[PDB]
Amino acid sequence: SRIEREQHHLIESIEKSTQYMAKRRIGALISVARDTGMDDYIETGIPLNAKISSQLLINIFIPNTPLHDGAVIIKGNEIASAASYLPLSDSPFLSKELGTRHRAALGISEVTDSITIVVSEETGGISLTKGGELFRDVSEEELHKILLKELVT
Ligand code: NA
Numbered sequence: 054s055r056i057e058r059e060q061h062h063l064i065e066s067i068e069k070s071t072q073y074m075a076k077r078r079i080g081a082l083i084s085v086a087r088d089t090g091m092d093d094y095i096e097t098g099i100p101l102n103a104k105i106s107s108q109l110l111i112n113i114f115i116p117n118t119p120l121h122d123g124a125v126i127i128k129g130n131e132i133a134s135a136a137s138y139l140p141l142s143d144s145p146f147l148s149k150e151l152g153t154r155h156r157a158a159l160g161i162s163e164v165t166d167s168i169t170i171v172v173s174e175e176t177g178g179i180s181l182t183k184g185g186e187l188f189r190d191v192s193e194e195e196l197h198k199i200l201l202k203e204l205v206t
């Protein structure tokens with residue numbers, strides 16, 4: 054069916070783009086909206102309303118480019134916005150070796166049911182946040198299984 058194919062394409066697009074960016078240590082921050090509206094953070098970014106593709110995600114996060122400075126927010130079947138703000142967690146439990154992208158991913162995860170993916174520009178490690186929890190430096194298998202569980206409904 055249609056939504057099936059879209060959600061699997063979304064997963065593939067996330068997996069391909071973060072693999073590309075992780076090998077090159079390109080920082081990335083991708084938040085996927087679910088039941089909780091994120092329109093109030095979409096409004097802070099540059100509106101794209103674009104089809105989802107691994108290629109567009111990669112191009113967005115290229116450093117020192119107009120769209121890279123913040124978060125991509127995916128809503129339904131579109132890349133809604135780029136360079137968006139996400140709220141920074143105040144948690145002192147988040148390791149000090151992790152940067153602003155991780156703290157923003159943790160922050161949005163505390164106030165929405167979104168699923169947020171981080172690529173670290175320091176390590177290339179991929180992490181995910183959900184419900185105020187951080188899954189740090191996930192494997193490709195782990196990333197795949199989590200995206201399947203959380204994004205295919
Ligand atoms: Na800690």
Ligand code: NA
Pocket residue numbers: 186187188189
């Ligand atoms: Na954890």
